[PDB]
Amino acid sequence: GGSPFSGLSSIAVRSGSALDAIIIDGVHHGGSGGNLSPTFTFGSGEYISNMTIRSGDYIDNISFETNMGRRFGPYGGSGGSANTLSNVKVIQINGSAGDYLDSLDIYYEQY
Amino acid sequence: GGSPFSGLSSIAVRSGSALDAIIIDGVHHGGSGGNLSPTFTFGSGEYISNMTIRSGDYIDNISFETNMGRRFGPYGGSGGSANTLSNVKVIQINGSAGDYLDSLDIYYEQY
């Protein structure tokens, strides 16, 4: 019984040319620079299915598509190298933050 | 670089004899009954290492120990059956909620 939920229930970012911050369920991870994205709130049974991430020494860009045809991004800049997650169910987003988003540790089901 | 963080950054619950709610990074999952736990905010590099969960048709009790000797619980009641997670790193907490906490879908590293 019940309506499904996730502990990853909403995402925002702060971005300029790179990722200043990620804001996960209203919890700030990073610095104050860049401009604040609007918050993406996930629906019951909705999860991240695609995700493109540009990264270098820092997280430079973040975009994703959900299983419900919804989109978030791109936010950030054109630097670093691009990696893509496809046919996935993203479960967790961890990482390391300072004044910027230094790394991301994504946990997902690889379908 | 950077200080580690998790997308599972704080836990509270609402509990009576069972689990009315779990509150994950300030996002409410469940109903309004029972009494509100105080919020456990996780520190950088802190994660759930032990966890005892009583469950039946509903989540009945929740307790956990973190890798930093910190504790949360027990909260709830004495019904259902007990399961324990030991030598783990909890990564995600999902589930299904209504007026109560119907299920929990825990994602962890089994060490």
Swiss-Prot record, chains A, B:
Residues 1-110 form the Jacalin-type lectin domain. Pfam families: Jacalin (PF01419). One of its GO terms (molecular function) is identical protein binding. Disulfide bonds: none annotated. SMART domains: Jacalin (SM00915). Keywords: Lectin, Mannose-binding. Signal peptide: none annotated. Mixed specificity lectin with anti-HIV activity. Binds to HIV envelope glycoproteins, including exterior membrane glycoprotein gp120, and inhibits viral entry into cells. Binding to gp120 is dependent on gp120 being glycosylated, and is inhibited by mannose, glucose and N-acetylglucosamine. Belongs to the jacalin lectin family. This is Griffithsin. It comes from Griffithsia sp. (strain Q66D336) (Red alga).
